[model samples]
Target chain A: SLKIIAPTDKTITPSGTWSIGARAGDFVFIGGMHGTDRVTGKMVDGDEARIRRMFDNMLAAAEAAGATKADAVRLTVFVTDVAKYRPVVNKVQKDIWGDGPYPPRTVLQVPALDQGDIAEIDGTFYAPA
Target chain B: SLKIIAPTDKTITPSGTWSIGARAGDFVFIGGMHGTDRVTGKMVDGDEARIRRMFDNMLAAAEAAGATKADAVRLTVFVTDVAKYRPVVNKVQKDIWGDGPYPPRTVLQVPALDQGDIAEIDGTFYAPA
Candidate 1:
């Protein structure tokens, strides 16, 4: 069954969601996440900085639970502004993944994220039990 | 380790890419696929017919490898026209998994697909080893 890899904390934002990536039977599902601190509900910074920090935070959560960024087989990225962040996306991919094979990615530009959220990312990872 | 699920079959269209779904250790990843056949590069039919056929082919391929549609837990769908697809998608979901709790889904609209490609669908499934 699925487990909450990261505990929920409403202090992060008004939507009151948190990191959720865990194994469920044969599948590993990762819930959508946004850039916000668990203890303080506020925009930590601007878009690019917040996006990078959120990715780092997600990786930290996954690694804490015995997985790495390399285990990310599926990725969904939501950016408020698409055209502005294309280069940042490319740069960050290089920083995290290097030149190896890249995972399947779905990028979306939404009008807005949950209130007080700037950028968010979430994905799936798994290991044979 | 992950394995290439399908060979590079390009005769289907100019995209020159093929499927890559396989059980990689603990992760079952299904690569993006379109409605083009390997022997010929024709679209075969219009939207509804083509979508159904493409899904049939994808399901067949997955089942051929010892899995079922029930195993899919994550799906991403891209359509050239999102509004036109809302009804068809609702119907197709009914056809694919009647009464079963549906998997997490991400629906998106893209301005275009690869040349000669109308729609592309892909997903992930897994089974414990």
Candidate 2:
């Protein structure tokens, strides 16, 4: 059976009629998460800060669905400027994951994002029961 | 266990060091699929034709990993011009899927794509044993 994992935090609630994340069997699928602050309902400031916030939001959704950052297997990152911001994303990811064995990732440059977000990421995690 | 799905067709081979798709447990994660022709290793011409080709490539990869279009649960579509090409994507999807119960999808406009592709798509499919 499939279950939708809606975050208790309203800021992460999707503007569209879609779940923030869903768990099907042992796999958890997270939708594209941005850097919006949970309290302010606004995109967070700073490139590195916002990118880190995006990862935080993704992990938060994963935790809400009974998974953790280590369970993540794949991630797709979209950025408005891949050249300028990809290194920032890499810095943030290294800060979070540390050491080695990072998850597989694909980075793309998008023309725009919701609310002018510089970066957005979606992920897939494997957490067996 | 996790298994990498490498398509027999050479045209869809990723320029980077990533599998075309990977199956972790029963779920299949397909990397971004573009409109490259398997025969020529070039981007297919025309808007609708290229878009349909992209879907065909995705489904072909899915079938290679023992899944079908019906098993698809989610898709993320990227187009250089969403306003102009999204309707083409919808029409092609309708033509392929017929009536009712389409998969969840997110569409975005990208600044560019590899090989000057107009559109690209990545997907997640659930096929239980």
Candidate 3:
């Protein structure tokens, strides 16, 4: 059965009509984590900061669902400018993982995103029994 | 433990440094399913045809991993032109699902994709114990 994972952090609102995170059996699904500051309802400042915030937001939802960063199995990242932002994303990811084997990832360069956002990320995590 | 889900179909090749499908516990993960014809190593023809092919490819991998279309819980779709292609995608999905509740999906307009491809899709599925 599917279970909704609600974030304790009020800043991580679903904004549009969708769950921020959900759990089906041992898996956790996080919706696209935009670079927006949920508290301000605006994109966070700076490209690097926004990218980092995206991961942080995803982590908040995953943690709420009883998973951690290490549990991440797959990530799909969409950026307005892959040439400029992919490096920053990699750096942030490395900073988080710190020499650990990173999760499988696919990065795409998107023409645009909702709310003029530069990047968005969604993920699947495996929470073992 | 993480287990790789190898597709029985030879036409669905990873082509890159990632597994085509992976299973960690009760969940299944399929990487970006491009419009490419794995046998020819080239994209299939036509927008609608390619869209359908992408879903077919995903289903192939999912089924190989012991999942049905109904097991899918999430999908992320990327296309070169959202305005022109989103409707076609919806039609194809509906044709497949036939009035069933669709999985949660996030679609984005990408600037470009590798090998001049137009669209790519990846998915997450839950197979219960």
Candidate 4:
């Protein structure tokens, strides 16, 4: 059985059957989340704003699964422009995850994302029983 | 300790020391893989053939770590063309995974991938005990 992780503050109503966050075995996988404003239900504009929302949503999903950003051992970052994301991405990640020994990450420049957003972030968190 | 999954049949020498796949805590994380032909060491062309190689390489990595497609809990698929991939993607997945209860997946249309490949796939597998 799939244990869905629904964030209390943010909303993630997937249009498809897949849940936003699910724990399969010991790994908690969070699907790609765009930078959508919670109340407005619109994709947040601009690089910094979108990045903020994206990480926030990731943290929320992690918390919902009884994990934290620290528990996330890998993050796959997809952005429209690698140059734009490179400068400030790590700083923001450190802010979200805290301290050192950060999770492994691989960033890719992608053509598009859901709702034409500039960035999408998804990851796997290890929460062992 | 991390047991890196290196397929003997395929050449996946990571540019850095990150390894092709690593078992971290119970979950195995395979880095983003472009549909690169093992012998030639180049990204394969087109959508259909690329998808074939992509899943093939994924299964190879899984097997290298003493697991199978059935052990894959989640896959994050990054594609350049959703329309081209949609029609035949599931059939290929079924071919790779066999029977029912397919692992969860999330597909996103991205602008670019490594080596200008049309598709890059990364995934998480749970290899219990």
Clashes of each: 0, 1, 1, 7
Model 2 — TM-score against the truth? 0.64
**DockQ of candidate 3 compared with the true complex:** 0.23
Shift of residue A63 alpha carbon in model 2, Å: 11
Instruction: Kindly indicate the candidate among 3 and 4 with the higher lDDT.
Output: 3
Tell me the spans in candidate 1 whose CA falls farther than 4 Å from its real position.
A6-20, A23-28, A37-41, A116-118, B1-7, B10-27, B31-82, B87-122, B127-129
Is candidate 1 or 3 superior in TM-score?
3
DockQ of every predicted complex = 0.16, 0.18, 0.23, 0.22
Residue clash pairs of candidate 1: none
Sliding window of 10 residues with minimal summed lDDT for model 2 chain A: A97-106
Q: Which candidate has the top score in TM-score?
A: 2
Candidate 3 chain A minimal-lDDT segment of 10 residues: A7-16
lDDT by residue (A1-129, candidate 1, tens digit) is: 576564443212224444456656534566666666656645567666677667776665666455666666556666666566645765677677776355545455555776746557766665445
Q: Chain A TM-score for each candidate, in the given order? A: 0.77, 0.93, 0.94, 0.87
Question: What C-alpha lDDT values do all the predictions have?
Answer: 0.60, 0.81, 0.81, 0.73
Where does model 4 sit among the CAPRI classes? incorrect
Q: lDDT tens digits, residues B20-114, model 2?
A: 77777888877778888876778888999999999998888778788888899989898889999989999999999999578999998878765
* Candidate 4 ranges with C-alpha deviation above 4 Å: A1-11, A16-19, A24-27, A37-50, A69-77, A81-111, A124-129, B6-25, B31-46, B78-117
Cand. 1 TM to true fold: 0.62
Local accuracy of candidate 4 as per-residue lDDT tens digits, A27-46:
68887777887566688777
